[PDB]
Amino acid sequence: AAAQVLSSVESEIGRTTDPVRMYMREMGTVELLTREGEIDIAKRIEDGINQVQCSVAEYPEAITYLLEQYDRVEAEEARLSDLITGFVDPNAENSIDPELAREKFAELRAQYVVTRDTIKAKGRSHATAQEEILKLSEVFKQFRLVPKQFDYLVNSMRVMMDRVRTQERLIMKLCVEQCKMPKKNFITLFTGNETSDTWFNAAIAMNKPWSEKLHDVSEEVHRALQKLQQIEEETGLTIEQVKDINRRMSIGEAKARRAKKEMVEANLRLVISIAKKYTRGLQFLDLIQEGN
Amino acid sequence: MGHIELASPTAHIWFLKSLSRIGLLLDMPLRDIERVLYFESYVVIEGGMTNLERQQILTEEQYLDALEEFGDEFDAKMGAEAIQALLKSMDLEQECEQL
Amino acid sequence: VPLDGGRFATSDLNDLYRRVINRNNRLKRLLDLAAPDIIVRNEKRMLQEA
Amino acid sequence: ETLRVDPTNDRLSALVEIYRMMRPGEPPTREAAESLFENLFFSEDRYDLS
Question: Which ranges does the record mark as transmembrane (chain C)?
């Protein structure tokens, strides 16, 4: 409980105006980890990292976005651009060679072509279709890409999630807030069909005098529906799947941020110790920020 | 002439140390404002419940207590942003007719 | 302005403006770096001090 | 009367008050206070009367 004396010192400070001493007091609350904490934090970071890998693996177009760039640079008789470094580069537990890239892409094309028909069979929830999609995900997981392309890969997921969530919020922004749509039945009816106007006209079938005046807003409440359906068609993914992916990737990245935040301040003492030897060219406190 | 856009709002020094011109305007002690500017104590810009009140200084522990007790119902923060929000929330004519 | 002996001399206002702009762009980088809030508070404090 | 005004009751309290006087704001410890007190007037390098 090192924070209890914080109240007994701050309420009894001399109100020192020196930034350095108050900053080093602020960073003095935390302790130093050794021989168990650092490995724990590394594991807590890597589990989040592979959770993000799983989140981006379930995206059906992720494999296509990985493969189409290398396919484009294949017809160039070689891949001289830096994106060849951003190839699959499988993890093992050096320059990219054709005997590696093409060998890894053979099973990628195989899964790309064999995971299409199985989904159509016995619906999306087909057991063999789901296990084949998971097999494609696993064969995607055997890679190790570069952070550069991975950044835009996750940014595409972020922007598509933002677009779909804004479209979903627009339903409330247009009618629920104005016409007072009761969310108690709204949430139940929305998750039922989400593809047609079954619940939309089921609301009209009920008494619902507020909903009876929906024709004037039909061409502005159904455009959101059309946008949602178009997004689902171009993505090939249902609302529940993408929502689950976003929900788990958010907590994974939050855990990763928490772990790295827990780890950073455990070496602020190292930073300030190493900053002392470099002073007086610029300052003492700016060097602290650069070290951080 | 030229200008530099400051990422975070910052406080003018003449209207802070000269005796206060913002201490009277906010009717707050100078020490409390100095503590707020140094990122040491929270300030409640507005509180929905009657437990808290506007312009009440806050230490971190009871600030976390308020967070767990209320959360988004009350509004409190630090820095020169807090002072700027305080100046924003003030209505001059009501104080003019009241005092 | 240059001096006759090949040196230079300038007002300390230049030093103050350099310091403020340097830590201003440093805070600009730190804001989108999503660093822990302690370092952001420290950078804001030093921006105010500058 | 000086004893009457004195709030300290032992060496640790006196050293704590001395540390608070010399280095305001910085929390004192069990070892820093007497070290600073010794270096104030009892270290050859940091004090001299000739």
Answer: none
